[PDB]
Design a protein around this ligand. Structure first.
Ligand SMILES: O=c1ccn([C@H]2C[C@H](O)[C@@H](COP(=O)(O)NP(=O)(O)OP(=O)(O)O)O2)c(=O)[nH]1
Ligand SMILES: O=c1ccn([C@H]2C[C@H](O)[C@@H](COP(=O)(O)NP(=O)(O)OP(=O)(O)O)O2)c(=O)[nH]1
Ligand SMILES: O=c1ccn([C@H]2C[C@H](O)[C@@H](COP(=O)(O)NP(=O)(O)OP(=O)(O)O)O2)c(=O)[nH]1
Ligand SMILES: [Mg+2]
Ligand SMILES: [Mg+2]
Ligand SMILES: [Mg+2]
Ligand code: NI
Ligand code: NI
Lengths: 169, 169, 169
């Protein structure tokens, strides 16, 4: 109770850190330096393993700062209780490939990185540095009941079969 | 307690299944065969209805395998307690429409499906087969209090009004 | 217990509202009128502040109606306990910029808005009106333990290091 086991898989790995006392998640550091071109997909290694206890799920999800400023989209990962593998960040550079070329790379602050050597990149390309906080881990309790098949449900709800914007907008 | 009612709506429907003993969600099978072109949006029918009890929400969310390998993006659906309608998978083929043509269709393993007959498809088109696990359902408890309007909050937090990457990166 | 403090920041702000008795979230109204061109990113102000108590997280997430009908993509925001700032909707118009022009704007019902004056817009542009329900807030309890670094985990799980579609599809 009130203790989570964390296993670092390499020297490139870093221990997750909570920002404030009442904050929800633990900021996840990147273990590798990755360059992502427009519309490219990848799984960023963190070299961090956790042992979520039974009755809980981990949500490997994006940070508001990175997601709002950059075209980097992270799909929220559902970390199962007992997953002792490498926590991978399911990421996509969602910037459009307009077939235009630039001489700069973007950082996770959406700013152009200063380089001494001349290089030609695609417009919308991002670079993630090793040891940068690009994601966070929020752990929530879960309900895992036994499924019971029925002909119809025992009670009629006020909601019914209404959905997908059945109310106003 | 510890029992969830599930109602199958057709012969094309399949009962949700949990992968491991300590796993979080129940894998959701597709009830229909759908072909999705680049940048096309659809709501995939599962023909499965559930009865989430009061004080819980269902999260109809993507699987890591499908989402990381394919351009198929699923928006996490919040299933209300008492929604007895058809569970629809809010999906988009997020592949770019580069106006290029191919003779193959992709499966949910991102592999080109072998076909005897010659057909011309758009580059980035996917095909979802009936009875395939493309999504999962994770059920979490919720807090639904009565809202109280105030002039200002009763306590000052260490966080304050800071957000959107107020700390480092 | 069973009470959430809400602070309205302007006259343009509106109090969040729950749709049904057993519904999960509170519908969030937009405080500003915003026009979003293809592939444009923005943070929509709600002028609403909340005081989430310790041990809970708020999920500022999209509604199924808007997300399924429109190209408007909202990233689920994790609202920390004690965040008294303006709740911003992290949004992107994910419609492709095909360099085509139209004389109509889309509403959040994906319908073309009737206008008396002639204007030229980009194809895929959306308009969000002030006082429209574009998002919702679902509050879930969290587990925030102290992190303990270990050489290896105390128990071997049936899952192990398997992930990213290790089972079938
Ligand atoms: O992906 C989804 C999302 C929701 N749903 C169902 C479950 C939920 O009870 C219902 C409506 O969900 P939301 O309240 O989150 N969206 P919205 O507010 O637009 O619909 P409504 O106006 O009917 O509440 O639709 C799905 O079947 N699939
Ligand atoms: O969509 C959002 C997401 C977050 N927020 C607020 C709530 C939260 O308390 C705060 C920061 O959220 P995160 O910690 O998840 N993102 P980040 O770590 O980048 O910001 P910070 O560095 O300030 O913690 O911003 C919004 O208003 N809208
Ligand atoms: O972003 C992610 C998502 C999942 N994972 C891990 C944790 C989880 O226990 C495992 C599989 O998660 P899912 O069950 O949600 N996806 P899928 O059903 O496709 O994989 P599998 O078939 O192995 O269960 O992969 C990550 O490391 N990063
Ligand atoms: Mg943070
Ligand atoms: Mg799974
Ligand atoms: Mg709703
Ligand atoms: Ni999500
Ligand atoms: Ni896109």
């Amino acid at each position: 109770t009130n203790t989570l086991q964390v296993k670092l898989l390499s020297k490139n790995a870093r221990m997750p850190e909570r920002n404030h006392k009442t904050d929800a998640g633990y900021d996840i550091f990147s273990a590798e330096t990755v360059v992502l071109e427009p519309q490219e997909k990848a799984v960023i290694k963190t070299d961090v393993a956790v042992s979520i206890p039974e009755g809980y799920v981990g949500l490997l999800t994006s940070r508001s700062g990175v997601s709002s400023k950059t075209h980097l989209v992270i799909e929220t990962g559902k970390i199962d209780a007992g997953y002792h593998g490498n926590l991978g960040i399911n990421i996509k550079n969602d910037h459009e490939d307009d077939k235009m070329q630039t001489i700069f790379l973007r950082n996770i602050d959406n700013e152009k990185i200063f380089e001494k050597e001349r290089h030609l990149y695609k417009l919308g390309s991002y670079r993630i540095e090793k040891g940068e906080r690009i994601a966070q881990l929020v752990i929530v309790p879960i309900w895992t009941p036994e499924l019971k098949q029925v002909e119809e449900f025992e009670s009629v709800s006020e909601r019914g079969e209404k959905g997908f914007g059945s109310s106003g907008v």
